[PDB]
């Protein structure tokens, strides 16, 4: 199936408390493989997957330089943005960058993306054709003109269409056992008496990989969402994921309600009813 | 491997 490689960067200023906190993190699909943390001792890109340890010292030095360079650009960005929005020097602000590439089941290039945010809001992003920029406001327009004049899109597209997909390809074969797996959800259902008039049915999905899953509640074949509650998919801590969905139901009518489970580790979608 | 086409805002 489809695969992805993504890198996530967070920088947060702490004026009066030294230089900004910087955390970088690498993922293949839903598996983390590298980190960098500026408050840690090593000051290096560190491994977070067993299959990436085998990379030699040229990889680790190279990744350390690139990541420390990402860090400095954000330090300057935090100062630049503080000025663009006329914010005070005393307050804490955030810069977030996310980029990467998607491939298909043949592992040919599918898609590329690069998004940038200031304080939790979209600032500037690369458009899907990978040749232009979306600028949200007046200050982002200044950034867009700067990045157009330095021809930044061209360099990014080159990384996104070449280097990114080739390293994705390499990681996928190196981490074959864990990266190309599908773990089907283990499904069960629970029942709780809220009142004598109301009842809650909870549909559980456990031990699954990848994290992408769909949980829907159906009544008599027609799906309904009006009394539905869905939690965020959560990591189990062992490389698998967990999720539930619940409905509030008139008790007695528990026979009318079916839960539908969709995941790429299911050959056919699962149905589940309280007997 | 991380990017090499990044510039300041």
């Amino acid at each position, epitope marked *: 199936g489809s695969h992805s490689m993504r890198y996530f960067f967070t920088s947060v200023s702490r004026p009066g408390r030294g230089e900004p906190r910087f955390i970088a993190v690498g993922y293949v699909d839903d598996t983390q493989f590298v980190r960098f943390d500026s408050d840690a001792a090593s000051q290096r890109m560190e491994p977070r997957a067993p299959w990436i340890e085998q990379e030699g010292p040229e990889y680790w030095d190279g990744e350390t330089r690139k990541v*420390k*360079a*990402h860090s*400095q*650009t954000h330090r300057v960005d935090l100062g630049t943005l503080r000025g663009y929005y006329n914010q005070s020097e005393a307050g804490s602000h955030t810069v977030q960058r996310m980029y990467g590439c998607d491939v298909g089941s043949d592992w040919r290039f599918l898609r590329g993306y690069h998004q940038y945010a200031y304080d939790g809001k979209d600032y500037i992003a690369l458009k899907e054709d990978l040749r232009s920029w979306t600028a949200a406001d007046m200050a982002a327009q200044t950034t867009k003109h700067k990045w157009e004049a330095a021809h930044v899109a061209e360099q990014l597209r*080159a990384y996104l*269409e*070449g280097t990114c997909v080739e390293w994705l390809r390499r990681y996928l074969e190196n981490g074959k056992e864990t990266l190309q797996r599908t773990d089907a959800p283990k499904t069960h259902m629970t029942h709780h008496a809220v009142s004598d008039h109301e009842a809650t049915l909870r549909c559980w999905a456990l031990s699954f990989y990848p994290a992408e899953i769909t949980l829907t509640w159906q009544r008599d074949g027609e799906d309904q969402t009006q009394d539905t509650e869905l939690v965020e998919t959560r990591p189990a801590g062992d490389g698998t994921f967990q999720k539930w969905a619940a409905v509030v139901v008139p008790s007695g009518q528990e026979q009318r309600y079916t839960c539908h489970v969709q995941h790429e580790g299911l050959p056919k979608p699962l149905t589940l009813r309280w007997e | 491997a991380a990017g*090499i086409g990044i510039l*300041t805002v």
Partner: T-cell receptor
Amino acid sequence: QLNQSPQSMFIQEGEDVSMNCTSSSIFNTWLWYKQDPGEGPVLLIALYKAGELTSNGRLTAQFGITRKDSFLNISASIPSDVGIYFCAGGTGNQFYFGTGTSLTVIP
Amino acid sequence: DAGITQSPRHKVTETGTPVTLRCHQTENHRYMYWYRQDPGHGLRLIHYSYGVKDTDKGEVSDGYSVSRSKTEDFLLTLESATSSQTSVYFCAISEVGVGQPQHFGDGTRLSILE
């Protein structure tokens, strides 16, 4: 670390000049610089994608498919094209420089 | 219009003399580099710097140290003060980002004589 070849070549005025580099390492950016005597390297071309680029008019350069190779071409050569030319390869946010190729144009 | 001034352009001194070379740059935030150039070897990186008080070593840093007390200045000081450090020395600059091309100063001719 880059092997540039040859260390000093010769062209007659008006001809075409071709110029190359080599490594066993992968590089994601290729740069070509010219150095005039008494001065530092001046950037001629920056190559990013594996393909064809022209940022002088008279200079064309190519990034290799294997990313271990690059070349520089000069057309309708002229006496001021005299100088030391250098390739630079980019990986891990570092540039690695070839050892110099030294052109002299015979008038 | 590079904005780099190397000082001095020429220095002749005996072994045992520490020599500081200065690279001045006028455009606020910049990555800065010191290289040496020698006949059979091309350009070799000595030390480089991603911002104020942040420096790291390149391939030929042995015998050299480096200072970045402010954004405008990157000082290379020849610590060992030795005849093998006879070279042409080149400061370079790069825009703050990842992988941006470097632009060089005009050079320093340094001869250390025994």
